[PDB]
C-alpha cells in the first residue's frame, strides 16, 4: 500500500514545484502596467434588427464566415438559418430529437451540425442537388450528452461530450480518430484557435486545459476558479483566452506563462455567466449574464463600460461577427437581436 | 417598391417558411408531455412496458388515449450531472415518479449500511423541492404490492423505519409509507401529489394517468384567467 502513498507525495511535490515556478515568474499585475492609457468613454449600442420566429428557448448561435448568415437552434426542433441584413429566412431544417444544445457553421458555408441530449452529432448538407436538406452523417460514439461542437475544417469536427472526454471525428470514414481524456468533470465548453492547431476546453470543476490536435495530449492546465467553467473564447491574437464561470467572475489567462492576469468581478453581480466573446481588436470583452442583461466589460481596464439590457429572459448565446460589424445575442424568449 | 425583381421572390420564401413553422408549432402544442423518473430497480421498465405503446440517451414513447397524445421522456441513460440538463425540462405537465414497496430491506450495492429507501427519499426531495419544478404536480406510483405484503409478513417493518407503533399489517403500512412520502413536500400550496398503487390491470393505470392529467389541465385553466 506504500506505492500509492509514494506516488501521491511525488505528485504533491510536483504540484509544489509547479506553483513555486509559477509564483517566481510573475512580477506585477497587468492592471499596474496599463495605468497610463485613456479608457473608452461609453459604449452606447442600440438594437438594429429583431429576428423573431422561434417558439421555444434558444441554446446556440453561430456566425457564418461571410458575416451575413447565422444559424440558431431551439427546443422546438428547428435549425432556422437567418439572413442578418434583410431578416428573411433561408431554411427550416427540422430535427429528429427536439433536444439540442449546440450549433456550428462550416468555414466554407456548406455544412451545419447540431448535437443535443441524444448524444448524437448529426451533420446536414446545404449544397445538395435537390431543394431539401439531407443528413450527410450521424456520429454516435459518446456515452454522455454533447455540449458543444465546432468545425475544425470541412472534413473534420471536434466534439465536447459530457462523459469527461473530447474526441475528434472524421466525416468520410465516420469513426473518431483521436480521443482526449484527463478531465474530472463534465466538459461543456471549447473553442478553436484562429490557426486551427490548438484548442482549449473548460471542465466542470474549476479547471481549464489546453489540447493539441496533432499530437493529442494535455500540455498545460489552468486553475483559480471556485464553482466551475461555463464559457471559453480565445483572444483575437490567438495567444490568450478568457473564461467565464458561475460565481459572477470571468478571468483572463496567458498561454506562454500559466499565470492569471486580470479578474472582471463586480460587487453588484451575484449571477452566473453563460457566454463570453471578445471583440475584433481584443479590446471589448462582451459577457452575457443570466440576470436578464448583458455587459460590455473592458478587456484591459476591468471596469464596466456599457449595458445591453434589451432582453426579456436569460441570455444563453452571443457572438461577434468576423469583421467586427455587429454582435448578436439570443435569449430564452425566442428573440434574437442585432446590436451595432 | 425598392425591392428588385428577384428580391421579392426571396421575401415570399420567408412568408411560406414562417407559415410552415407556425402550422407545426401549433400541432405540437396540443399534446400532453410528462416526464418519467425513478431509481434503477424502481420498476420503471415494467411500468413503461405494461402501458400501451404505439411507438442509450433519452427515450421517447408516444401513445394515445381518449383523443390525447402523450409523450414520455425516460431520462435514465444519462450518467452525467443532473443539475446541468435539468433546466430544459422546465415546461412539463407532470412528473411520473416510481418507487418499489418491496425494496426496503435490500441494501444498495457495494454498501452494507445504507438502505435504498434513503436515497429514494433523497431523490424525491431533490425533485420536489427543485427551483424549477415549483409549479408542476407530481404523480407517484407504488410498483410492487404482493411481494411487499410477503416481505412485511416474513420480515418486520421496523428494520427499515426506526420508529413504528402500529402492527405488521399491509393496510396500515401502505398508509404510513404514503404519509411519509407526502411529508417530503415543502411547496404545499403550489403543487399536489397524486398517489396510486400499481395493479395487474393496465386499464386502471391508464385511467389514473388520464384523470391526473385532466385535473392538472383544469387547475391550469382555472389559474389562467385568474378565476381563483
Amino acid at each position, epitope marked *: 500500500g506504500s506505492e500509492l502513498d509514494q506516488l501521491r507525495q511525488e505528485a504533491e511535490q510536483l504540484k509544489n514545484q509547479i506553483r513555486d515556478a509559477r509564483k517566481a515568474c510573475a512580477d506585477a499585475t497587468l492592471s499596474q502596467i496599463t495605468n497610463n492609457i485613456d479608457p473608452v468613454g461609453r459604449i452606447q449600442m442600440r438594437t438594429r434588427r429583431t429576428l423573431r420566429g422561434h417558439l421555444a428557448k434558444i441554446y446556440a448561435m453561430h456566425w457564418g464566415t461571410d458575416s451575413r448568415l447565422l444559424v440558431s437552434a431551439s427546443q422546438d426542433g428547428k435549425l432556422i438559418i437567418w439572413d442578418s441584413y434583410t431578416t428573411n429566412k433561408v431554411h427550416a431544417i427540422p430535427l429528429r430529437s427536439s433536444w439540442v444544445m449546440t450549433c456550428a457553421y462550416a468555414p466554407s458555408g456548406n455544412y451545419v451540425a447540431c448535437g443535443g441530449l441524444d448524444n448524437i452529432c448529426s451533420i446536414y448538407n446545404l449544397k445538395t442537388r*435537390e431543394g431539401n436538406v439531407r443528413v450527410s452523417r450521424e456520429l454516435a460514439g459518446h456515452t454522455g450528452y454533447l455540449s458543444c461542437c465546432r468545425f475544425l475544417d470541412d472534413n473534420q469536427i471536434v466534439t465536447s461530450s459530457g462523459d469527461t472526454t473530447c474526441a475528434l471525428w472524421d466525416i468520410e470514414t465516420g469513426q473518431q480518430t483521436t480521443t482526449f481524456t484527463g478531465h474530472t468533470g463534465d466538459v461543456m465548453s471549447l473553442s478553436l484557435a484562429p490557426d486551427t492547431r490548438l484548442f482549449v476546453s473548460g471542465a466542470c470543476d474549476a479547471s481549464a486545459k489546453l489540447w493539441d490536435v496533432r499530437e493529442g495530449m494535455c500540455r498545460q492546465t489552468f486553475t483559480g476558479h471556485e464553482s466551475d467553467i461555463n464559457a471559453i473564447c480565445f483572444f483575437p491574437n490567438g495567444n490568450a483566452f478568457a473564461t467565464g464561470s458561475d460565481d459572477a467572475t470571468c478571468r483572463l489567462f496567458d498561454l506562454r506563462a500559466d499565470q492569471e492576469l486580470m479578474t472582471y468581478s463586480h460587487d453588484n453581480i451575484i449571477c452566473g455567466i453563460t457566454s463570453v466573446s471578445f471583440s475584433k481588436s481584443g479590446r471589448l470583452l462582451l459577457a452575457g449574464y443570466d440576470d436578464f442583461n448583458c455587459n460590455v466589460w473592458d478587456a484591459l481596464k476591468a471596469d464596466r463600460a456599457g449595458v445591453l439590457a434589451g432582453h426579456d429572459n436569460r441570455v444563453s448565446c452571443l457572438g461577434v461577427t468576423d469583421d467586427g460589424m455587429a454582435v448578436a445575442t439570443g435569449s430564452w424568449d425566442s428573440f434574437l437581436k442585432i446590436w451595432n | 417598391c425598392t425591392l428588385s425583381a428577384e*428580391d421579392k421572390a426571396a421575401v*415570399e420564401r420567408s412568408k411560406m417558411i414562417d407559415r410552415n413553422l407556425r402550422e407545426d408549432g401549433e400541432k405540437a402544442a396540443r399534446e400532453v408531455k410528462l416526464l418519467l423518473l425513478g431509481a434503477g430497480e424502481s420498476g420503471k421498465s415494467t411500468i413503461v412496458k405494461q402501458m400501451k405503446i404505439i411507438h442509450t440517451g433519452i427515450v421517447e414513447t408516444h401513445f394515445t388515449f381518449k383523443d390525447l397524445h402523450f409523450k414520455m421522456f425516460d431520462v435514465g441513460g444519462q450518467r452525467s450531472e443532473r443539475k446541468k440538463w435539468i433546466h430544459c425540462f422546465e415546461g412539463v405537465t407532470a412528473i411520473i415518479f416510481c418507487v418499489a414497496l418491496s425494496d426496503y430491506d435490500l441494501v444498495l450495492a457495494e454498501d452494507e449500511e445504507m438502505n435504498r429507501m434513503h436515497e429514494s427519499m433523497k431523490l424525491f426531495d431533490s425533485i420536489c423541492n427543485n427551483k424549477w419544478f415549483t409549479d408542476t404536480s407530481i404523480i407517484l406510483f407504488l410498483n410492487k404490492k404482493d411481494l411487499f405484503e410477503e416481505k412485511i409478513k416474513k420480515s418486520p417493518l421496523t428494520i427499515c423505519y426506526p420508529e413504528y407503533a402500529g402492527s405488521n399489517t399491509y393496510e396500515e403500512a401502505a398508509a404510513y409509507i404514503q404519509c411519509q412520502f407526502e411529508d417530503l413536500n415543502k411547496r404545499k400550496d403550489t403543487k399536489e401529489i397524486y398517489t396510486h398503487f400499481t395493479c395487474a390491470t393496465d386499464t386502471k393505470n391508464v385511467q389514473f394517468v388520464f384523470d391526473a392529467v385532466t385535473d392538472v389541465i383544469i387547475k391550469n385553466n382555472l389559474k389562467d384567467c385568474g378565476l381563483f
Partner: single-chain antibody
Amino acid sequence: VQLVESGGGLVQPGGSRKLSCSASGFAFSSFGMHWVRQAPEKGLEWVAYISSGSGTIYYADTVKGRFTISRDDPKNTLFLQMTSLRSEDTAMYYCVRSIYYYGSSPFDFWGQGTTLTVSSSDIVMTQATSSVPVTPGESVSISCRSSKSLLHSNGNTYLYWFLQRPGQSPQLLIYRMSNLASGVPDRFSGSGSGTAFTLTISRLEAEDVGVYYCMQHLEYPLTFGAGTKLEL
C-alpha cells in the same frame, strides 16, 4: 433530375391543346417554374412564371390573357392551357426550374423540350455580332450590351449567361456578373461595369460550340438577346 414534355401535335388555327410536363427526382413543391418559347433560327423569349405555392402568377405582354397556367403539387405535374392560337405560335417549348434565395442559382436545369407546329419601357438588349469564326485554342470575347443600367442599388448586376449545345438544350454557365455555376469548368469567366458586359474564355475546345445568349433580370419582363453563333 429528369424532365420531359408531352402534348406535342399539329394543331389548326383556332384550336387549343394543353401542355403537360412531369418532374421527378426533387422537391417540386418549392421550385418556381419558367416557360421558354424558342422559335426556329431565332432567339428564345420568356413566356410565363409561377412562384412556389402558386402565390404570384406572371405572364408576358404578348400572350397576356390568352394563356392559362397552373401547378399540381401532389403529382409533380405542370399544366399550360391557351385559349386562342395564331400562326406565330409555332416554336419549341421548354420548362426550367428556378429557386430564388441568397446564393441560389436560378435556371439551373433546362428541360428537354417539345416540338409544336402550326400550319396557316421594356429593356432593349442587343448583342454585338451574329457569328464569329474562331480557330481552336484561342481566347474569345463576347460582348452583350443593354439599354439600361442593370446594376442595382444592392450592388449586384442581374445579367445571366448560358450556352446552347448544337442539338441539345442549353445549360447555365454564369449567374450574376461573375460566379461560376456547378458542373461547368473554370475556363469561362465574365465581367461587367453596369452598361456593357463581356465574357472571356481562356481555352476553347471542340465540345463547347454553339450559340450564346444574355438574359436580364433587373426588371421583370425578361428579354433575351439575338444570339451569337460560335463557328469551329
